[PDB]
Design an enzyme around this catalytic site. Structure first.
Site, PDB file in Angstrom:
ATOM      1  N   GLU A  13      -1.836   5.311   3.638  1.00 50.96           N
ATOM      2  CA  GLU A  13      -3.041   4.757   3.046  1.00 50.96           C
ATOM      3  C   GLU A  13      -4.230   5.574   3.478  1.00 50.96           C
ATOM      4  O   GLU A  13      -5.300   5.056   3.712  1.00 50.96           O
ATOM      5  CB  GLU A  13      -3.244   3.308   3.455  1.00 50.96           C
ATOM      6  CG  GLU A  13      -2.235   2.339   2.871  1.00 50.96           C
ATOM      7  CD  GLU A  13      -2.368   2.151   1.376  1.00 50.96           C
ATOM      8  OE1 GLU A  13      -3.476   2.262   0.849  1.00 50.96           O
ATOM      9  OE2 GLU A  13      -1.356   1.875   0.726  1.00 50.96           O
TER      10      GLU A  13
ATOM     11  N   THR B 264       4.395  10.563  -2.341  1.00 47.26           N
ATOM     12  CA  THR B 264       4.495  11.506  -1.256  1.00 47.26           C
ATOM     13  C   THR B 264       5.684  12.435  -1.399  1.00 47.26           C
ATOM     14  O   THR B 264       6.760  12.036  -1.802  1.00 47.26           O
ATOM     15  CB  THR B 264       4.529  10.785   0.089  1.00 47.26           C
ATOM     16  OG1 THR B 264       3.311  10.077   0.254  1.00 47.26           O
ATOM     17  CG2 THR B 264       4.655  11.759   1.196  1.00 47.26           C
TER      18      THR B 264
ATOM     19  N   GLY C 122       9.596   4.017   0.474  1.00 46.76           N
ATOM     20  CA  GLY C 122      10.102   2.699   0.863  1.00 46.76           C
ATOM     21  C   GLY C 122      10.851   2.033  -0.264  1.00 46.76           C
ATOM     22  O   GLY C 122      10.366   2.003  -1.378  1.00 46.76           O
TER      23      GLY C 122
END
Ligand SMILES: Cc1cc2nc3c(=O)[nH]c(=O)nc-3n(C[C@H](O)[C@H](O)[C@H](O)COP(=O)(O)OP(=O)(O)OC[C@H]3O[C@@H](n4cnc5c(N)ncnc54)[C@H](O)[C@@H]3O)c2cc1C
Ligand SMILES: Cc1cc2nc3c(=O)[nH]c(=O)nc-3n(C[C@H](O)[C@H](O)[C@H](O)COP(=O)(O)OP(=O)(O)OC[C@H]3O[C@@H](n4cnc5c(N)ncnc54)[C@H](O)[C@@H]3O)c2cc1C
Lengths: 692, 691
Positions: free
Chosen positions: A448, A156, A195
């Site tokens: 997702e 991303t 993350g």
């Protein structure tokens, strides 16, 4: 006034455990068999029991005080939590490990993901997209055991999320040094929401456009070392930072990353599928076992997560409901328990039905996927028509997956939210979990695959399936009802609305109706000269509606199919009762669909209303059995009002005082802030002297 | 890469230029749209003055709030009260409310923490005290919060909605001329009492009035909780911090127990109910207790829903104008998400709903003021004209209830949807969604549980139906119940772009639900069910009645306020919004209109096409409709929502300011992370055993 049960008197404080015992007393089935239906048999149940007890007993894992934790402590304790979970990696099978991380997600959605980014996304990429030799190399560097190594997944970008094909980060081959240059061209292409990157990760799986000799080969995956392992300092050309406060899931250290002319060897590109030689020649072989077991698997996992979270909150709200009394209309009588109200039954019991249904759709999907994978393996002679069916069965499984993920994630959100409202102002207590769970859950809708983007793709996908059928292609098992032409004429025709076969047909009708009409319009619009793309855009509402109706029909179907296939006789009638409530409630919520296709008339909606009320009462009687069937200990419930014994006020008052000891009546800021204000001096209201 | 006006922009550089483009399309003066939203020029300059007094005040700066732990929120709220107190001497009641609502666009915690004294406690002593009681408590510092801080103890662990069922007792003792306040069991513990845990010296305690073993119902008693000098608890008072909430952590909600606390008789607030020094209890009829406070409160909430909704709808739409994801034409840039028909559907009907909530607020206030005057004017009364003013009042209460319930739930939904409309970036704390949603949602539970209000309303609507059937008069709000033509009215090929036809469709569907559930009720009562058992059997129907009527009310109010107050330059653009609102509303509940037979299946396709069309017409002007709210970047309080549209630059800046990145390693790197990454291997040895 007071309540008398069995010769004894109770008050508002003392009645609850007695009321909830009273509910348990009604249960007509053995609970163990309902738990076997939810988790697909005895073996699975013992496994889940084993895993749940392993988690709850772990002292470092304890969630009891997490509601009061500020973000810095969530960040720190998630690491300690990871070190503890790390003990099971040696021992666990893949099935155990997946299910342990999902069970743990019932009460800690942060830690699971902070590990998950390495454990699934990074490890998934090097295993899924590297050659065997590349995988083995990263494992020798410590990547499997998280030893001097911690991975994250960087796809991303600030400018691109849903449109992965549009990423802007570049990987430029230089022949002279046999290297890639990884570059972020503008700050818009900064990696975002990564993350583990902010504080944890030594390496990343970087998604970048592959550029060789001026040719853009699309987005591939490269291993880039982010930190010197020894000191945790940033490697040259690597910028990254903590993204900071999130709505939820603060334990995860989502970071941004920029790459500036970062030099990596060619060999760091993962090359199972796409390969680049030392001379700069690019190849992308056919590679037939590309089968995305993983893509379906990722979605089935999320459908199951929706179950795993929902059951907690539905259990909290229902147990509260069985003991909570508000209002009455009798002089001689105690206030009615809210569970006894028919409106309150409508608020919660369908959602209890919905949660069971979520699990059956996860199970039905995993099972259809397994038989379809097993069917491909048996047919060596390659009877081609047979293979084609197995392939479209698989294709339509992936497609149906998108809708189920979208709607079960949204539904889980709604249930958390509704269950909270159902507990009134005590819903708003952080200790009853609603607030934190809702904030933590909600990202599941965005990541997702954005839910809205998945629904529009799948809606387009159904129109393409319907149109390809008309042109003579076979339909995948998941959309076979599109071939059923008995549905054109089908109506209720005085049939029984308690019959599952009828209610199934009615969902097949409205799904087929919406899809055939949308496909017809797409044909008028293309003939009319629109491109395929412009026609789908014109039909955005219709594509979404198709996704919605088809998914709803799939939940209905999977509930009934799994009951017929796997439910023992002693639970079966109580499950059908659940299933009928789900299905008739769903019809009631979307009455218009049924009116418009002509399956029902105005008078049949009245009857549907009456049936939903009726099954509400049938389900309500057995409510303690349905909720106790989930087998959640008080540790997983993690809310005082939801404890097994039902002593709602005693535990709640206990929890508040434990976390908020009351011996000092003045705030830490009393001297500094509050006391100076309350005791402030009066205003000077003199006015300056001026002659005249 | 994109070229505009011969110049090059990239993902990072374009967004300010794109949003300027949208401003370029606007066909009305944005100032007149602001005038429409707030009832004209004067109100607008007052709003502006207030907003600027809040933004400027360094103490109130909200920029760092998202990163704040609960302990900070608690302390900070007090410093903020001290600063806001500077405006108490000069503000009018109008300015004080408004300033407080404006403040709550960005700080839902502070206004409430102040509010429990400011509104609830003071409201009780003013509302229910005699003049002498009121002046006494003012003399002790109440009005000025000088050595005195109040709170409102009504709710108990046992009871929230059923106020009449509260268990805390007040027993009169003539000998000492005292009430004994007592919490009989832990179930009766006062709960959710804002201000109580740490702040309040005094409470307005709601307890059953007991004189000579006679229970006279719930009344209000002033009880000192703390010694003012030391802030210590008074004899017989137990209280504590309830602790972590889903939101609004700045508020110090406490629990309280009373254990044989004795208060002078005179602490009972005696405007309506009086107890003498001998235990003589009196309750005179006294004008019906002035529920303009009750209506007035609901109106406030409806407006609050507008005041919050505007913020989040603005953030999402401005983001939508600059954000590009996906493209279909091989040569062109990716499409701005505001140009996607499905994105328009998700947001522009919410933008419409935002405006509509305001209109319903403004309508309610006007109707309530208007009915209130037509009660004073009727000092001399004619049997028929006093009766319909009373009945317009009653129908205002009911209408207030549904409006509060649905507009608060809508605001929650708006926040949630706007967050998802911004994707992943919606989940950043700095873009406001998380904290706003956590704070807002309690509006759905307090000041009347939204579900309880709906079920009351739907019972009330049925009763008004039965009333009329039996020759009783109808309040204006439910007039459509008296319309003969409605029962067989159908679309009959009329224009769906005509507002009047849309009003009739909504009137038809609400009346259809109400009359039908009335027939069911009468039939079930005939069957021998008591009034109350039949309503319970019809619980779905009562709710459905309330939703339908409320949705219809929102529709008519939007059109009615446009016709009453919209200047020419903005009227077409508000009818476009209103139309989108009303047709989108029809699409969302198509089954209702199919079921009464107003529309056929063929008409449902046309409504969908019209929702699509009005989406386009409204989309073209988005910058105008959102700028008209007049919010500065301080009120937006989100990087992606800023005026200039420079969404990425502000966002990357906010993140780095709050999260300096110079140190790569976490504060726990040595303690926790480093010892895990470099932990020693397992010991693989196995104990020796010959065998
Ligand atoms: C807590 C968190 C952790 C994350 N961690 C990671 C991570 O570790 N690694 C990683 O790679 N990513 C991560 N992400 C990113 C996440 O995967 C993406 O945010 C998501 O998949 C896509 O969202 P986006 O921000 O790209 O929004 P976009 O795709 O730009 O969409 C934004 C909005 O526009 C709408 N929209 C977009 N396209 C269309 C269309 N064609 N038609 C109609 N509407 C459209 C969408 O519905 C959405 O509402 C994380 C995100 C979060 C919130
Ligand atoms: C943040 C916060 C601050 C607060 N501050 C204060 C304060 O300062 N002072 C104060 O006095 N109070 C305060 N309260 C209390 C608040 O007013 C109550 O939470 C609310 O008014 C009543 O809800 P309850 O918890 O009593 O739930 P109940 O009334 O028991 O309702 C619980 C659930 O049961 C359902 N239910 C109840 N009755 C029925 C029925 N007849 N039919 C169908 N369904 C029903 C309701 O819909 C609800 O979902 C506060 C609450 C919160 C959350």
């Amino acid at each position: 006034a007071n309540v008398e049960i069995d010769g004894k008197q109770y008050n508002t404080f003392t009645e609850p455990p007695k009321a909830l015992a009273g509910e348990r007393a009604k249960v007509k089935f053995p609970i163990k068999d309902m738990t076997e239906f939810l988790h697909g048999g005895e073996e699975n149940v013992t496994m889940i029991e084993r895993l749940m007890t392993e988690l709850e007993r772990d002292p470092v894992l304890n969630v009891s005080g997490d509601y009061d934790m500020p973000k810095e402590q969530l960040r720190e304790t998630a690491v300690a939590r990871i070190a503890a979970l790390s003990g099971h990696w040696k021992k666990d099978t893949e099935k155990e490990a997946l299910l342990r991380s999902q069970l743990h997600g019932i009460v800690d959605m942060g830690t699971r993901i902070r590990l998950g980014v390495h454990t699934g996304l990074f490890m998934g990429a090097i295993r899924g997209s590297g050659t065997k030799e590349q995988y083995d190399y990263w494992v020798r560097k410590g990547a499997a055991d998280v030893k001097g190594f911690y991975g994250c997944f960087a796809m991303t970008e600030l400018g691109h999320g849903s449109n992965v094909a549009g990423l802007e980060t570049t990987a430029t081959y230089i022949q002279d040094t046999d290297e890639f240059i990884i570059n972020t061209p503008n700050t818009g292409a900064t990696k975002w929401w990564i993350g583990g990157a902010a504080h944890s990760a030594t390496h990343t799986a970087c998604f970048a456009r592959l550029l060789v000799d001026g040719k853009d080969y699309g987005v591939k995956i490269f291993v880039v070392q982010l930190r010197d392992v020894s000191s945790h300092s940033l490697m040259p050309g690597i910028a990254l930072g903590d993204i900071g406060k999130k709505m939820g899931r603060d334990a995860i250290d989502n970071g941004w990353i920029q790459f500036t002319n970062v030099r990596i060897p060619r060999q760091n590109m993962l090359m199972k599928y796409a390969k680049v030689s030392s001379t700069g020649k690019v190849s992308q072989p056919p590679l037939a076992q590309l089968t995305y077991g993983a893509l379906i698997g990722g979605r089935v996992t999320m459908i199951a997560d929706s179950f795993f979270v929902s059951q907690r909150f539905i259990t909290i709200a229902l147990r509260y409901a069985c003991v909570r009394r508000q209002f009455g209309t009798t002089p001689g009588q105690p206030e009615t328990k809210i569970i006894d109200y028919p409106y309150h039954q409508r608020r919660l019991l369908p959602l209890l039905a919905f949660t069971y249904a979520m699990k059956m759709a996860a199970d039905q999907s995993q099972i259809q996927y397994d038989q379809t994978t097993d069917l491909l393996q048996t047919i060596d002679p390659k009877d081609k028509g047979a293979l084609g069916k197995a392939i479209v069965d698989l294709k339509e499984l992936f497609a149906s997956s998108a809708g189920l993920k979208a709607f079960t994630t949204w539904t889980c959100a709604n249930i958390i939210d509704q269950c909270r409202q159902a507990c009134g102002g005590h819903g708003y207590s952080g200790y009853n979990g609603f607030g934190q769970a809702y904030a933590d859950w909600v990202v599941q809708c965005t990541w997702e695959g954005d839910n809205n983007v998945l629904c529009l793709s799948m809606g387009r996908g159904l129109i393409q399936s319907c149109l390809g059928h008309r042109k003579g292609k076979p339909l995948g098992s998941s959309v076979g009802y599109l071939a059923n032409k008995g549905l054109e004429q089908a109506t209720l025709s005085g049939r029984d609305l308690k019959d599952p076969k009828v209610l199934i047909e009615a969902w097949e009708k409205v799904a087929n109706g919406a899809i055939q009409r949308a496909t017809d319009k797409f044909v008028e619009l293309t003939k009319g000269g629109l491109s395929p793309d412009q026609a789908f855009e014109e039909l955005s509402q219709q594509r979404f509606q198709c996704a919605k109706i088809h998914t709803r029909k799939h939940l209905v179907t999977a509930f009934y199919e799994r009951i017929n296939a796997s439910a023992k006789a002693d639970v079966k009638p109580y499950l059908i009762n659940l299933a009928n409530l789900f299905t008739l409630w769903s019809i009631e919520e979307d009455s218009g669909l049924f009116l418009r296709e002509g399956f029902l008339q105005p008078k049949d909606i009245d009857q549907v209303t009456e049936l939903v009320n009726h099954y509400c009462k049938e389900v309500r009687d057995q409510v303690a059995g349905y909720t106790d069937a989930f087998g959640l200990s008080d540790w997983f419930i993690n809310a005082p009002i939801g404890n097994y014994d039902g002593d709602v006020y005693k535990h709640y008052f206990a929890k508040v005082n434990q976390q908020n000891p009351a011996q000092n009546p003045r705030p830490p800021y009393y001297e500094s802030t509050l006391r100076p204000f309350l005791f402030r001096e009066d205003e000077d209201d003199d006015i300056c002297e001026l002659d005249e």
